[PDB]
Amino acid sequence: VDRWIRHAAGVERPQLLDTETISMLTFGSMSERNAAATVHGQKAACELI
Amino acid sequence: WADVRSCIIKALTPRLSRGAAAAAQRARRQRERSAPKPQELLFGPRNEPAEQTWYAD
Secondary structure, three states, X not given: OHHHHHHHHOOOOOOOOOHHHHHHHHHOOOOXXXXXXXXXXXXXXXXXX | OOXXXXXXXXXXXXXXXXXXXXXXXXXXXXXXXXXXXXXXXXXXXXXXXXXXXXXXX
């Protein structure tokens, strides 16, 4: 069901981050790369129920 | 040469207390606690049974 969810949402798997990379990521990391091209600007939104 | 005051009687007399039952529950949740995730290793408060108090004949 996790593979089905990752397919349905388009977001990829973590693909097994190492535990040192996990402590890196909870220390801080820039995971998301830049897009192909932006004409308006940097994206910004969030969500609340 | 057994006695009403022996090693096992003084061993099990603190077992009859209320705090014995409370600490029994505390140890049964304590030793049977899962391995911690790195999140509480990074931000959660820390964790702590050094030597035993036996009786003998």
